[PDB]
Protein backbone atom coordinates (compact mmCIF):
# COMPACT_ATOMS: atom_id res chain seq x y z
CA UNK A 1 0.00 0.00 0.00
CA UNK A 2 3.03 2.25 -0.47
CA UNK A 3 1.56 3.62 -3.71
CA UNK A 4 -1.52 4.85 -1.85
CA UNK A 5 0.70 6.60 0.71
CA UNK A 6 2.68 8.24 -2.11
CA UNK A 7 -0.55 9.32 -3.82
CA UNK A 8 -1.82 10.83 -0.56
CA UNK A 9 1.47 12.71 -0.11
CA UNK A 10 1.30 14.07 -3.67
CA UNK A 11 -2.29 15.24 -3.16
CA UNK A 12 -1.44 16.78 0.22
CA UNK A 13 1.50 18.65 -1.35
CA UNK A 14 -0.85 20.58 -3.67
CA UNK A 15 -3.38 21.22 -0.88
CA UNK A 16 -3.78 24.69 0.62
CA UNK A 17 -4.47 25.31 4.29
CA UNK A 18 -3.07 26.21 7.67
CA UNK A 19 0.33 24.89 8.73
CA UNK A 20 -1.03 23.03 11.77
CA UNK A 21 -3.64 21.12 9.74
CA UNK A 22 -1.11 20.14 7.07
CA UNK A 23 1.43 19.07 9.69
CA UNK A 24 -1.18 16.92 11.43
CA UNK A 25 -2.23 15.30 8.16
CA UNK A 26 1.39 14.58 7.25
CA UNK A 27 1.96 13.15 10.73
CA UNK A 28 -1.05 10.85 10.32
CA UNK A 29 0.26 9.71 6.92
CA UNK A 30 3.67 9.06 8.49
CA UNK A 31 2.09 6.99 11.27
CA UNK A 32 0.18 4.91 8.71
CA UNK A 33 3.41 4.28 6.80
CA UNK A 34 5.17 3.25 10.02
CA UNK A 35 2.35 0.78 10.76
CA UNK A 36 3.33 -1.03 7.55
CA UNK A 37 6.10 -3.63 7.35
CA UNK A 38 8.53 -5.11 4.86
CA UNK A 39 9.15 -3.52 1.47
CA UNK A 40 5.80 -1.70 1.64
CA UNK A 41 6.95 0.21 4.73
CA UNK A 42 10.34 0.89 3.13
CA UNK A 43 8.83 2.38 -0.02
CA UNK A 44 6.22 4.33 1.95
CA UNK A 45 8.93 5.91 4.10
CA UNK A 46 11.02 6.55 0.98
CA UNK A 47 8.15 8.52 -0.53
CA UNK A 48 7.75 10.32 2.81
CA UNK A 49 11.43 11.32 2.72
CA UNK A 50 11.13 12.41 -0.91
CA UNK A 51 8.06 14.51 -0.08
CA UNK A 52 9.79 16.26 2.83
CA UNK A 53 12.83 17.26 0.74
CA UNK A 54 10.50 18.52 -2.01
CA UNK A 55 10.72 22.24 -2.76
CA UNK A 56 7.00 23.04 -2.43
CA UNK A 57 6.64 21.45 1.03
CA UNK A 58 7.08 23.94 3.87
CA UNK A 59 10.40 23.83 5.71
CA UNK A 60 8.50 23.65 9.01
CA UNK A 61 6.72 20.59 7.65
CA UNK A 62 10.05 19.46 6.18
CA UNK A 63 12.20 19.81 9.30
CA UNK A 64 9.76 18.54 11.94
CA UNK A 65 8.27 15.61 10.00
CA UNK A 66 11.79 14.45 9.16
CA UNK A 67 12.62 14.90 12.85
CA UNK A 68 9.51 12.96 13.88
CA UNK A 69 10.49 10.47 11.17
CA UNK A 70 13.93 10.08 12.76
CA UNK A 71 12.33 9.56 16.19
CA UNK A 72 10.32 6.51 15.12
CA UNK A 73 13.13 4.84 13.12
CA UNK A 74 15.28 3.65 16.11
CA UNK A 75 12.30 1.44 16.95
CA UNK A 76 12.65 -0.39 13.64
CA UNK A 77 15.36 -3.09 13.91
CA UNK A 78 18.86 -3.24 12.39
CA UNK A 79 17.59 -3.83 8.87
CA UNK A 80 16.20 -2.21 5.70
CA UNK A 81 15.93 1.09 7.63
CA UNK A 82 19.64 1.68 6.97
CA UNK A 83 19.51 1.67 3.18
CA UNK A 84 17.04 4.53 3.60
CA UNK A 85 19.50 6.18 6.00
CA UNK A 86 21.97 6.36 3.11
CA UNK A 87 19.03 7.38 0.93
CA UNK A 88 17.86 10.10 3.33
CA UNK A 89 21.40 11.39 3.89
CA UNK A 90 21.91 11.53 0.11
CA UNK A 91 18.59 13.30 -0.44
CA UNK A 92 19.38 16.15 1.97
CA UNK A 93 21.44 18.47 -0.23
CA UNK A 94 19.22 21.38 -1.39
CA UNK A 95 18.08 22.09 2.19
CA UNK A 96 21.29 20.81 3.80
CA UNK A 97 22.17 24.46 4.47
CA UNK A 98 18.64 25.29 5.68
CA UNK A 99 18.65 22.59 8.37
CA UNK A 100 21.39 20.20 9.51
CA UNK A 101 20.04 19.03 12.89
CA UNK A 102 18.33 16.05 11.24
CA UNK A 103 21.48 15.28 9.23
CA UNK A 104 23.55 15.21 12.42
CA UNK A 105 20.94 13.07 14.19
CA UNK A 106 20.85 10.55 11.33
CA UNK A 107 24.65 10.39 11.14
CA UNK A 108 24.89 9.99 14.92
CA UNK A 109 22.30 7.21 14.79
CA UNK A 110 24.03 5.58 11.81
CA UNK A 111 27.48 5.80 13.43
CA UNK A 112 26.30 4.08 16.62
CA UNK A 113 24.38 1.52 14.56
CA UNK A 114 27.49 0.77 12.50
CA UNK A 115 29.34 0.57 15.83
CA UNK A 116 26.93 -2.21 16.82
CA UNK A 117 27.97 -4.41 13.88
CA UNK A 118 31.69 -4.21 14.79
CA UNK A 119 32.20 -1.63 12.02
CA UNK A 120 34.49 1.23 13.04
CA UNK A 121 35.45 1.75 9.38
CA UNK A 122 32.11 2.92 7.97
CA UNK A 123 30.96 4.44 11.28
CA UNK A 124 33.96 6.78 11.13
CA UNK A 125 33.31 7.89 7.54
CA UNK A 126 29.63 8.60 8.23
CA UNK A 127 30.39 10.65 11.35
CA UNK A 128 33.09 12.65 9.53
CA UNK A 129 30.29 13.77 7.22
CA UNK A 130 28.96 16.00 10.01
CA UNK A 131 29.88 19.63 9.16
CA UNK A 132 30.79 20.79 12.66
CA UNK A 133 32.78 23.71 11.21
CA UNK A 134 29.67 25.41 9.78
CA UNK A 135 28.64 27.24 12.95
CA UNK A 136 25.27 28.69 11.88
CA UNK A 137 23.82 25.80 13.87
CA UNK A 138 26.25 26.48 16.68
CA UNK A 139 26.74 22.95 17.99
CA UNK A 140 27.46 23.41 21.69
CA UNK A 141 31.17 22.97 22.38
CA UNK A 142 30.33 19.72 24.16
CA UNK A 143 28.52 18.38 21.08
CA UNK A 144 31.44 19.18 18.77
CA UNK A 145 33.75 17.69 21.39
CA UNK A 146 31.55 14.59 21.68
CA UNK A 147 31.40 14.11 17.91
CA UNK A 148 35.14 14.61 17.36
CA UNK A 149 35.86 12.33 20.33
CA UNK A 150 33.65 9.63 18.80
CA UNK A 151 35.43 9.84 15.44
CA UNK A 152 38.83 9.48 17.13
CA UNK A 153 37.63 6.53 19.21
CA UNK A 154 36.15 4.87 16.12
CA UNK A 155 39.40 5.42 14.21
CA UNK A 156 41.44 4.09 17.15
CA UNK A 157 39.49 0.82 17.10
CA UNK A 158 40.06 0.62 13.32
CA UNK A 159 43.71 1.79 13.45
CA UNK A 160 43.93 4.23 10.55
CA UNK A 161 44.64 7.22 12.79
CA UNK A 162 46.29 9.50 10.27
CA UNK A 163 42.95 11.31 10.26
CA UNK A 164 42.38 10.66 13.98
CA UNK A 165 45.52 12.70 14.55
CA UNK A 166 43.73 15.53 12.73
CA UNK A 167 40.56 14.60 14.65
CA UNK A 168 42.08 14.53 18.14
CA UNK A 169 43.35 17.97 17.07
CA UNK A 170 39.99 19.50 16.15
CA UNK A 171 38.70 17.94 19.36
CA UNK A 172 41.58 19.71 21.12
CA UNK A 173 41.12 22.92 19.12
CA UNK A 174 37.66 23.42 20.63
CA UNK A 175 38.53 21.50 23.81
CA UNK A 176 39.56 24.63 25.71
CA UNK A 177 36.02 25.98 25.31
CA UNK A 178 33.89 23.21 26.83
CA UNK A 179 32.49 22.73 30.34
CA UNK A 180 31.67 19.08 31.11
CA UNK A 181 34.37 17.62 33.36
CA UNK A 182 33.35 14.02 32.60
CA UNK A 183 33.58 14.82 28.88
CA UNK A 184 36.99 16.38 29.59
CA UNK A 185 37.98 13.20 31.45
CA UNK A 186 36.63 11.12 28.57
CA UNK A 187 38.67 13.32 26.24
CA UNK A 188 41.92 12.95 28.17
CA UNK A 189 41.49 9.16 28.26
CA UNK A 190 40.97 9.09 24.49
CA UNK A 191 43.81 11.58 23.98
CA UNK A 192 46.10 9.40 26.10
CA UNK A 193 44.96 6.41 24.04
CA UNK A 194 45.92 8.29 20.87
CA UNK A 195 49.37 9.02 22.31
CA UNK A 196 49.78 5.36 23.29
CA UNK A 197 48.92 4.21 19.77
CA UNK A 198 51.13 6.40 17.58
CA UNK A 199 54.56 6.47 19.23
CA UNK A 200 53.90 8.63 22.27
CA UNK A 201 54.18 5.90 24.90
CA UNK A 202 56.16 8.25 27.15
CA UNK A 203 53.56 11.00 26.68
CA UNK A 204 50.63 8.60 27.11
CA UNK A 205 52.18 7.35 30.35
CA UNK A 206 52.39 10.97 31.52
CA UNK A 207 48.77 11.56 30.53
CA UNK A 208 47.66 8.26 32.07
CA UNK A 209 49.57 9.06 35.27
CA UNK A 210 47.93 12.49 35.45
CA UNK A 211 44.54 10.81 34.96
CA UNK A 212 45.45 8.13 37.52
CA UNK A 213 45.22 10.50 40.50
CA UNK A 214 41.61 11.53 39.80
CA UNK A 215 38.37 10.94 41.71
CA UNK A 216 35.43 10.85 39.29
CA UNK A 217 37.18 8.15 37.26
CA UNK A 218 36.03 4.70 38.35
CA UNK A 219 38.48 2.91 40.66
CA UNK A 220 38.59 0.04 38.17
CA UNK A 221 39.17 2.57 35.38
CA UNK A 222 41.74 4.36 37.55
CA UNK A 223 43.57 1.06 38.01
CA UNK A 224 43.22 0.36 34.28
CA UNK A 225 44.52 3.83 33.37
CA UNK A 226 47.47 3.36 35.72
CA UNK A 227 48.03 -0.11 34.27
CA UNK A 228 48.08 1.62 30.89
CA UNK A 229 50.58 4.11 32.33
CA UNK A 230 52.79 1.27 33.60
CA UNK A 231 52.76 -0.61 30.29
CA UNK A 232 53.48 2.56 28.30
CA UNK A 233 56.32 3.47 30.66
CA UNK A 234 57.94 0.06 30.18
CA UNK A 235 57.49 0.23 26.39
CA UNK A 236 58.67 3.84 26.02
CA UNK A 237 62.16 4.91 24.97
CA UNK A 238 64.66 4.25 27.76
CA UNK A 239 65.84 7.68 28.83
CA UNK A 240 65.82 10.40 31.46
CA UNK A 241 62.09 11.10 31.08
CA UNK A 242 61.24 7.39 31.24
CA UNK A 243 63.44 6.90 34.31
CA UNK A 244 61.60 9.68 36.14
CA UNK A 245 58.23 8.13 35.26
CA UNK A 246 59.48 4.78 36.57
CA UNK A 247 60.38 6.51 39.84
CA UNK A 248 56.94 8.14 39.94
CA UNK A 249 55.19 4.82 39.26
CA UNK A 250 57.14 3.22 42.13
CA UNK A 251 54.99 5.25 44.55
CA UNK A 252 51.43 4.06 43.83
CA UNK A 253 50.26 1.19 46.02
CA UNK A 254 47.78 0.25 43.28
CA UNK A 255 50.81 -0.25 41.05
CA UNK A 256 51.75 -2.98 43.53
CA UNK A 257 48.35 -4.63 43.06
CA UNK A 258 49.04 -4.95 39.32
CA UNK A 259 50.69 -8.05 37.85
CA UNK A 260 53.40 -5.95 36.18
CA UNK A 261 54.43 -4.62 39.62
CA UNK A 262 57.42 -6.94 39.58
CA UNK A 263 58.34 -5.85 36.06
CA UNK A 264 59.04 -2.21 36.88
CA UNK A 265 60.36 -3.20 40.32
CA UNK A 266 63.22 -5.08 38.67
CA UNK A 267 63.33 -2.29 36.08
CA UNK A 268 63.71 0.82 38.24
CA UNK A 269 65.89 -1.05 40.74
CA UNK A 270 68.38 -1.64 37.89
CA UNK A 271 68.21 -5.32 36.93
Amino acid sequence: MAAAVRQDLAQLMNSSGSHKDLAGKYRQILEKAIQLSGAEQLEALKAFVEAMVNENVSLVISRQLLTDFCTHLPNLPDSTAKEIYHFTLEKIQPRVISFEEQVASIRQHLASIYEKEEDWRNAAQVLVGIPLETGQKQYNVDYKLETYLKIARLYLEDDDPVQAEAYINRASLLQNESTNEQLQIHYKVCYARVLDYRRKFIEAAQRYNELSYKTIVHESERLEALKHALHCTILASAGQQRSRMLATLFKDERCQQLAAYGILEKMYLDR
Binding site: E55, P94, I97, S98, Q136
Partner: protein
Amino acid sequence: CGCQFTSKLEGMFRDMSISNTTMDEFRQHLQATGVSLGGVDLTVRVLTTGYWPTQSATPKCNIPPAPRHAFEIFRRF
Protein backbone atom coordinates in the same frame (compact mmCIF):
# COMPACT_ATOMS: atom_id res chain seq x y z
CA CYS B 1 53.82 55.02 1.54
CA GLY B 2 56.00 51.95 2.11
CA CYS B 3 55.11 48.52 3.51
CA GLN B 4 51.87 49.69 5.14
CA PHE B 5 48.12 49.85 4.44
CA THR B 6 49.07 50.12 0.76
CA SER B 7 49.69 46.39 1.26
CA LYS B 8 46.04 46.12 2.32
CA LEU B 9 45.28 47.84 -0.99
CA GLU B 10 47.49 45.25 -2.71
CA GLY B 11 45.26 42.39 -1.60
CA MET B 12 42.18 44.35 -2.64
CA PHE B 13 43.55 44.39 -6.19
CA ARG B 14 44.50 40.70 -6.19
CA ASP B 15 40.86 39.83 -5.51
CA MET B 16 39.70 41.73 -8.60
CA SER B 17 42.32 39.89 -10.66
CA ILE B 18 41.17 36.51 -9.32
CA SER B 19 37.51 37.42 -9.89
CA ASN B 20 38.00 37.99 -13.62
CA THR B 21 40.35 35.01 -14.10
CA THR B 22 37.76 32.77 -12.47
CA MET B 23 35.09 34.58 -14.51
CA ASP B 24 36.60 33.52 -17.85
CA GLU B 25 37.65 30.15 -16.41
CA PHE B 26 34.05 29.49 -15.37
CA ARG B 27 32.94 30.68 -18.82
CA GLN B 28 35.01 27.91 -20.42
CA HIS B 29 33.56 25.30 -18.07
CA LEU B 30 29.94 26.36 -18.61
CA GLN B 31 30.75 26.03 -22.32
CA ALA B 32 31.74 22.39 -21.80
CA THR B 33 28.33 21.54 -20.27
CA GLY B 34 27.55 17.82 -20.13
CA VAL B 35 26.88 17.68 -16.39
CA SER B 36 25.76 21.28 -15.83
CA LEU B 37 22.77 21.39 -13.48
CA GLY B 38 22.05 25.11 -13.21
CA GLY B 39 23.15 26.10 -16.71
CA VAL B 40 21.90 29.69 -16.73
CA ASP B 41 23.57 33.12 -16.98
CA LEU B 42 26.08 33.41 -14.12
CA THR B 43 28.70 36.09 -13.37
CA VAL B 44 30.41 34.88 -10.19
CA ARG B 45 33.18 36.87 -8.50
CA VAL B 46 35.90 35.52 -6.19
CA LEU B 47 37.44 37.62 -3.41
CA THR B 48 39.63 37.02 -0.36
CA THR B 49 38.69 37.78 3.24
CA GLY B 50 42.19 38.91 4.20
CA TYR B 51 41.83 42.44 2.86
CA TRP B 52 38.14 43.19 2.44
CA PRO B 53 36.88 44.53 5.80
CA THR B 54 33.79 43.23 7.56
CA GLN B 55 30.96 43.90 5.11
CA SER B 56 28.24 42.42 7.31
CA ALA B 57 27.40 39.31 9.33
CA THR B 58 27.36 37.40 5.99
CA PRO B 59 23.91 35.81 6.49
CA LYS B 60 22.95 32.23 5.60
CA CYS B 61 19.49 32.73 4.11
CA ASN B 62 17.96 30.33 1.61
CA ILE B 63 18.58 30.33 -2.15
CA PRO B 64 16.07 29.65 -4.97
CA PRO B 65 16.44 26.19 -6.53
CA ALA B 66 17.70 27.31 -9.95
CA PRO B 67 20.39 29.53 -8.37
CA ARG B 68 21.09 26.68 -5.93
CA HIS B 69 22.10 24.39 -8.79
CA ALA B 70 24.12 27.26 -10.26
CA PHE B 71 25.85 27.79 -6.91
CA GLU B 72 26.38 24.04 -6.53
CA ILE B 73 28.20 23.90 -9.87
CA PHE B 74 30.63 26.69 -8.97
CA ARG B 75 31.35 25.42 -5.46
CA ARG B 76 31.94 21.91 -6.81
CA PHE B 77 33.95 23.34 -9.72
